[PDB]
């Protein structure tokens, strides 16, 4: 016989035939999957009285456990079973309700914001419902669904109930973001955006996808705060960190201006004791809302290579020092310019100064290299100024050895961030980055949390899925959609700090990047490591920047340039194609295919809605949803593994079946050169920066030890090709 506990409490006989039909349904269209295999694995686990939801988890996991490179369609079998389950969990049936009935219920329960019902009529929801294709749920992979279920879909944390499905998520994000559009265009934009996201052409960050449509207005996922050399700014900085990490934002802290250990008694304000005690304070601030005091809350802190304390700073996350010599749960960005590198090559010295003893040196470091050189050499003379000398080879080695040993000491080329930038370095210098080293935006110190004259940069992110687009001209519509969706959100969201609101309203800065690059290269038969992708990458990223700029341009015509457009190099008719690192000419000869001069005039005349548009970020979650390779990164392998409380989640790289040979796995790359050239070619067009990785497999090197010679040569190759930043250093375990 075998009985089954129903949804209520009622019990009825098992329907093995029903189970078979769901499985047959789920397996439709798929290849190399065995329904009967799934049955064998799951049925043996059934017991008299088993509840109905547990029969469901059982078949899902059974199908999931057969995901492999040889049978990758088990990703989709499991996915569909999981979807079906989630329909039942949310609606009591497979068919979703009508959009209007769903939104009304959710507003009742307080799970959707009621402005959706204010801003749209029943007629309009009826119409939106005709845009919706709930069958698009059938296109998720299993790992994708686990992410939807884990962090996207509106649900109860406590009770475990799921209240929506993916197409309502998608339609309602569109609905919310475009809700102030004139009725003439509104539902057009809603439809087009819903299409773009539901078919995976555009990806959005987790805070947006989980939050937009709910009663919250907190969606800011990364902030950039600059600390001034005063207790007031130190306090303000700290306070702003606390406020933001409580909303689970990642933090980039510029702390390079804090004067060094042993600097004169400023009267009261005690800067004698130096940087580290303050660095520890930012770290507790960053961890102020984390359960362990480690788990959650993340920050990257920035300082210049020539800071008097640099030797002490470089080793802040090294394993064994005294406890007061370490600040281990924050990452660092070491800031470097051309002169520093020149000292290395010439085998000369680097002179270390406290920023407080060298008038104008700090400002020049970012804004004006000739001026930096003048002041630097001037101050190396002057023996009245407190200074210290280190061998450049010694200093760089210390940095590179800490970078390698932790993977988490990062690099920012501050000249590149300002010579090749949408900002006039004399008005709005880029003097730091964010958590992940792809955001490059102006900041100003605060003298108090609510100081109206400070500037905090936030960034507003999205990505094009280069695998989901048949040709580059699709980027025009997608750029219109992405730029407009993000621009609306800037007005839509709230700002916990006046300085953050200033930055956003003033410059309206966007950071749109890409996912699925590796797959895209593979299907064009290119690779990372051999230069075979150089021209395609030029072609690809020209199209991205062109169309992004075009979209933001049209939007400026329609709605006005951003308040501080006059502080951009774009305002002076300067384009990314004018200011890039020239050495790039030697490694690609792709012509520009778009009318950049037409655009140049149109930008000078009408301005840009957004001061920046593009930034190449990492993606973990965004790209699992699309079954896409992460950002611009080569896959570590063909199948990725995640632990979860529900079993091992496997995801096979897209079209493994036809592309296994076309892929170039991370560790197949003979070295970093090809990749870094691709990053450089990308950086030609990108407004901000790129989360560029460096990788080393010890087993490719004599005695399994990575030579410093090579660590430094890749560093210099980065610089030569105008790479703004370097993020993680991956060293292979094995």
């Amino acid at each position: 016989n075998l009985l089954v506990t129903k949804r209520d409490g009622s019990t009825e006989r098992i329907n093995l035939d029903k189970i078979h039909r769901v499985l047959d349904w789920a397996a439709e269209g798929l290849h190399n999957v065995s329904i009967s295999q799934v049955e064998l694995r799951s049925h043996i686990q059934f017991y008299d009285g088993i509840k109905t939801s547990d029969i469901h988890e059982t078949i899902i996991k059974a199908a999931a456990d057969l995901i492999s490179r040889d049978a990758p369609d088990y990703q989709y079998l499991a996915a569909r079973l999981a979807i079906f389950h989630l329909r039942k969990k949310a609606y009591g049936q497979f068919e979703p309700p009508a959009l209007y009935d769903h939104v009304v219920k959710m507003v009742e329960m307080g799970k959707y914001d009621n402005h959706l019902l204010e801003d749209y009529t029943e007629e309009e929801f009826k119409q939106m419902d005709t845009f919706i294709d709930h069958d698009r749920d059938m296109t998720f992979s299993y790992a994708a669904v686990k992410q939807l279920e884990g962090k996207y879909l509106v649900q109860n944390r406590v009770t475990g109930e799921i209240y929506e499905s993916a197409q309502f998520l998608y339609i309602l994000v569109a609905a919310c973001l475009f809700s102030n559009y004139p009725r003439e265009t509104r539902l057009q934009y809603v439809k087009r955006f819903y299409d773009a996201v539901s078919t995976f052409k555009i990806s959005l960050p987790t805070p947006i996808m989980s939050g937009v449509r709910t009663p919250t207005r907190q969606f800011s996922s990364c902030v950039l705060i600059e600390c001034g050399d005063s207790l007031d700014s130190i306090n303000a900085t700290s306070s702003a960190i606390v406020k933001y990490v409580s909303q689970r934002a990642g933090i980039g802290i510029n702390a390079g201006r804090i004067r060094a250990l042993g600097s004169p008694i400023r009267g009261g304000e005690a800067f004698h004791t130096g940087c580290i005690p303050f660095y520890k304070h930012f770290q507790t601030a960053v961890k102020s809302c984390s359960q362990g005091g480690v788990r959650g809350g993340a920050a990257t802190l920035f300082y210049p290579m020539w800071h008097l304390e640099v030797e002490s700073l470089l080793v802040l996350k090294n394993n064994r020092g005294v406890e007061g010599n370490r600040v281990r749960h924050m990452d660092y960005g070491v800031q470097i310019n051309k002169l520093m590198y020149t000292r290395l090559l010439k085998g000369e010295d680097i002179t270390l100064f406290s920023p407080s003893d060298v008038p104008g040196l700090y400002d020049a470091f970012f804004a004006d290299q000739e001026e930096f050189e003048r002041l630097y050499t001037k101050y190396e003379k002057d023996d009245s100024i407190r200074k210290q000398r280190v061998k450049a080879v010694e200093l760089f080695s210390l940095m590179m050895q800490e970078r390698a040993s932790t993977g988490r000491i990062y690099i920012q080329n501050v000249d590149h961030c300002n010579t090749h930038s949408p900002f006039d370095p004399a008005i709005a210098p880029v003097r730091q980055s964010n958590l992940c080293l792809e955001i490059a935006l102006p900041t100003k110190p605060l003298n108090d949390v609510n100081d109206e004259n400070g500037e905090i940069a936030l960034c507003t992110l999205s990505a094009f899925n280069l695998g989901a687009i048949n040709n580059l001209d699709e980027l025009e519509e997608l750029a219109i959609l992405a730029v407009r969706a993000l621009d609306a959100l800037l007005d839509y969201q709230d700002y916990p700090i006046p300085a953050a609101k200033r930055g956003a309203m003033g410059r309206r800065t966007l950071g749109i990047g890409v996912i699925n690059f590796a797959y895209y290269l593979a299907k064009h038969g290119k690779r990372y490591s051999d230069g075979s992708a150089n021209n395609l990458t030029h072609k690809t990223f020209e199209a991205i920047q062109y169309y992004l700029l075009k979209a933001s341009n049209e939007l400026a015509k329609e709605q006005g340039a951003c308040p501080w457009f006059n502080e951009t190099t774009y305002a002076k008719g300067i384009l990314p194609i004018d200011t890039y690192k020239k050495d790039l000419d030697t490694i690609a000869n792709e012509p520009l295919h778009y009318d950049w001069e037409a655009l140049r005039e149109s930008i000078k005349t009408h301005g840009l809605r957004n001061s920046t548009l593009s930034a190449l970020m990492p993606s973990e979650t965004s790209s699992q949803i699309s079954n896409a390779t992460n950002g611009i990164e080569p896959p570590r392998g063909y199948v990725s593994i995640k632990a979860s409380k529900d079993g091992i989640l496997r995801q096979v790289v897209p079209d493994y079946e036809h592309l296994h040979d076309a892929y170039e796995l991370l560790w197949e790359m003979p070295g970093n050169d090809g990749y870094l050239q691709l990053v450089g070619i990308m950086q030609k067009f990108i407004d901000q920066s790129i989360s560029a990785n460096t990788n080393y497999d010890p087993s490719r090197f004599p005695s399994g030890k990575v030579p410093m010679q090579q660590l430094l040569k890749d560093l210099l190759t980065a610089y030569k090709f105008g790479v703004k930043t370097l993020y993680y250093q991956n060293t292979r375990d094995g």
Partner: peptide
């Protein structure tokens, strides 16, 4: 991890 052997001769050729 690292081998801290560095030659200046080799580096000095590089054009920034």
């Amino acid at each position: 991890q690292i081998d801290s052997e560095v030659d200046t001769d080799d580096l000095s050729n590089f054009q920034l």
